[PDB]
Design a binder for this molecule. Structure first.
Ligand SMILES: Nc1ncnc2c1ncn2[C@@H]1O[C@H](COP(=O)(O)OP(=O)(O)O)[C@@H](O)[C@H]1O
Ligand SMILES: [Zn+2]
Ligand SMILES: [Zn+2]
Lengths: 94, 439, 190
């Protein structure tokens, strides 16, 4: 339950009017939590293979994600290759 | 998971054709004259027959002006526009307040427009191929593009601009589109489910296969006011080069609307309504705490009420023989100058009574889903009659808190007196602050 | 991304990124009709499995060679048994009119030579009772030419029937969803 504990002296500003400041405070005092049903693919991805864009199969990109529970391989759909390495990281990354 | 704040206990004036009111109905009890006048006014409003009507009501705090305003707003339905904003919001920063008042008048008046549109949608097959007929390199102007959809496939070629739209969407052969033929551009549903599963993972959504016949046709009806059109026309909507991205990244500010734009929008809306596209409805304007306005507004409204498109406004001042804010000697009843009151009439909103106040408290208990005993209800109502109903209204909920902490579902005299002790009122503070050494 | 971040022009190919912890120390490889998708050995295997699916029990379980020869061009020894044929002369003892109403012609003899002919479709292929093109217009008159898929594939779970949380095996390449099924997949399916 976040609060708004601010003295009323600094209501004046050179970027927000009194009405805008009061409206901002009122709308900040009332919050909303949001639940999003996001997904995951966890597990040790021991290798990241990126095959060429073959005509029959547009991406044969192997990548072996496996947790402690099981051993498994996967496949990249010509969109996630740079998703791994937006920042330069290696395989084996959860 | 509910919140009732001094309202949601009101749902209508509760009248009939013959102007007969109901003593307890729609969250309103009493006020026969006020309810009759409000019913007559809203009946006049519903006919859309006039513009610029005005009225001032004399009502003290807690007498029921805001309740009447909310009830009248709900009388016309959600679709009829309304914008009752605080009287202190006029004094803005980035735009002169008379321009803001014109903007609100522009917002208030309503309209209902419509448009019928067609659209085509995965891609069955694809065959691309006119002559330059001169020194030009070539002339590409037709490509057969597939259109899968679900209920039947109808491939068709159009202007090449649709083809470049296909490349713009970057859709593959197994990709579904949604191409409204009115513009020839592409709206992307996403990828398809048939030529899908080419890989175990895909960040791009597979997207459900489109349902229905490909040559989709529909009609849309939207009720949009004119100020949205003005602000949409003011700023650019497209662009590809630096100007568009910098302007959109730039933060627009509130400006002054030119009257030539008013003439233009009136002309185009008249042209569209004459084709049957749009139908006309007036608006409703309300301002509370009006007596704090200055004399310049109080005298500009003298001519602003003569505007031929200005909808019906309602004027609400609670004070009495007061000078208009910023007037050295212009003192008037309710802080509104006589040369302005010579353009409208006066209603009297009066406070409530004993049985009226006790029924108000009981109904507030009902909407707050709490049970009230006769003794506590009568004590609350009585001390409201001496001083103020709002005291009992704001004591109801903490008394329910005390009852819950006492593991009971009723208010007893103990709870109301405990709330009285732990929570004072204005009257008890009128005789206690003077004996304070520390301010 | 991190603007003007550390990079030494090491690969950075948008469609090439190979790394590992070195348990094998290798790198990436380099150097709508089913008849134009896969080869013929696996479709032959699937047809053999389907022809076994034709076989219902011990009666037809060893009949697979006959079915294979038909397709490619006391349990099954024909319906001739005296415990079936020679007994049926008394099985209709409820009522019947079995009488000889027929002259003596080669049709009457064919009533008996073809009766227990010990003849099959395979013998039909090996005999001249029908010409060569009749078996072709019996076989080819059924099979299609090119239409093999016009709606997508399902790829159901092999053992269970799950629809989500699906995943393939490391080296067997068989569809499955539950990791519980993997316990028997790596034992009988992989
Ligand atoms: N006649 C009435 N019947 C029922 N409730 C009323 C009546 N008049 C006022 N109230 C209630 O009193 C509360 C406060 O009224 P308020 O808006 O302060 O009146 P005013 O606008 O005259 O100051 C409102 O939430 C309203 O529900
Ligand atoms: Zn399974
Ligand atoms: Zn396996």
């Amino acid at each position: 339950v976040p609060f708004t504990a601010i003295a009323g002296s600094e209501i004046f500003s050179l970027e927000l009017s009194k009405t805008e400041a009061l409206t901002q405070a009122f709308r900040k005092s009332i919050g909303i939590k949001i639940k999003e049903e996001t997904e995951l693919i966890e597990g040790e991805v021991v290798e990241i293979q990126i095959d060429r864009s073959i005509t029959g199969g547009h991406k044969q990109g192997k990548l072996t994600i496996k947790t402690t529970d099981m051993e498994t391989i996967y496949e990249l759909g010509n969109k996630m290759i740079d998703g791994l390495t937006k920042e330069k990281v290696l395989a084996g990354d959860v | 998971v509910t919140r009732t704040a001094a309202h949601t206990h009101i749902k209508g004036l509760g009248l009939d054709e013959s102007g007969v009111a109901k003593r307890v109905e729609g969250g309103f009890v009493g006020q026969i004259e006020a309810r009759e006048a409000c019913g007559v006014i809203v009946d006049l409003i519903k006919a859309k027959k006039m513009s610029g009507r005005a009225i001032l009501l004399a009502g003290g705090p807690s007498t029921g002006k805001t309740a009447l305003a909310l009830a009248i707003s709900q009388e016309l339905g959600p679709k009829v526009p309304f914008c009752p904003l605080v009287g202190s919001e006029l004094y803005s920063v980035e735009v002169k307040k008379t321009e803001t008042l014109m903007e609100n008048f522009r917002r208030a008046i309503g309209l209902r427009i419509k448009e019928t549109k067609e659209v085509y949608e995965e891609v069955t097959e694809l065959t691309p191929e006119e002559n330059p007929l001169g020194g030009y390199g070539k002339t590409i102007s037709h490509v057969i593009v597939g259109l899968k959809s679900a209920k039947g496939t109808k491939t068709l070629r159009l202007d090449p601009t649709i083809y470049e739209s296909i490349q713009r969407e970057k859709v593959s052969i197994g990709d579904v589109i949604y191409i409204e033929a009115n513009t020839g551009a592409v709206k992307r549903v996403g990828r398809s489910d048939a030529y899908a599963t080419e890989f175990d993972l895909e960040t791009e959504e597979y997207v459900p296969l489109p349902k229905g016949e490909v040559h989709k046709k529909k009609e849309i009806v939207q009720d949009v006011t004119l100020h949205d059109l003005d602000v949409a026309n003011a700023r650019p909507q497209g662009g590809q080069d630096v100007i568009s991205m910098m302007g959109q990244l730039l933060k627009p500010k509130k400006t002054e609307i030119t009257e030539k734009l008013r003439q233009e929008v009136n002309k185009v809306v008249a042209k569209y309504i004459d084709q049957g596209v749009a139908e006309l409805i007036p608006g409703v304007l309300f301002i509370d705490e009006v007596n704090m306005l200055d004399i310049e507004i109080f005298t500009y409204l003298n001519k602003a009420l003569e505007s031929n498109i200005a909808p019906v406004v309602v004027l609400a001042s609670n004070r009495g023989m007061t000078t208009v804010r910023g007037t050295e000697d212009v003192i008037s009843p309710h802080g509104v100058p006589p040369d302005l009151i010579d353009r409208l009439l006066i209603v009297r909103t009066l406070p409530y009574d004993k049985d009226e106040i006790r029924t108000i408290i009981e109904r507030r208990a009902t909407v707050e889903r709490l049970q009230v005993e006769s003794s506590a209800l009568d004590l609350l109502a009585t001390m409201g009659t001496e001083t103020s109903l709002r005291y009992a209204l704001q004591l109801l909920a903490p008394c329910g808190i005390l009852a819950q902490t006492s593991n009971r579902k009723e208010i007893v005299v103990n709870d109301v007196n405990e709330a009285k002790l732990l929570f004072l009122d204005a009257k008890r503070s009128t005789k206690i602050l003077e004996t304070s050494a520390n301010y | 991304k991190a603007l003007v971040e550390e990079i030494d022009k090491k690969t950075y190919n948008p469609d090439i990124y190979f790394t590992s912890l070195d348990p094998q120390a290798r790198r990436y490889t380099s150097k709508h009709s089913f008849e134009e998708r896969y080869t013929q050995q696996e479709i032959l295997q699937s047809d053999r499995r389907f022809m076994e699916l034709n076989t219902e029990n011990f009666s037809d379980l060893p009949n697979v060679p006959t079915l294979l020869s038909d397709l490619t061009g006391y349990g099954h020894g024909w319906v001739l048994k005296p415990e079936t044929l020679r007994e049926i002369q008394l099985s209709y003892k409820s009522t019947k009119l079995p009488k000889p109403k027929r002259k003596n012609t080669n049709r009457i003899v064919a009533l008996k030579k073809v009766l227990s002919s010990k003849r099959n479709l395979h013998s039909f292929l090996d005999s001249a009772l029908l010409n060569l093109m009749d078996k072709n217009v019996i076989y080819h008159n059924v099979y299609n030419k090119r239409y093999f898929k016009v709606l997508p594939l399902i790829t159901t779970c092999s053992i269970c029937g799950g629809y989500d949380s699906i995943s393939s095996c490391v080296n067997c390449g068989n569809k499955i969803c539950s990791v519980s099924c993997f316990k028997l997949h790596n034992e009988t399916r992989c």
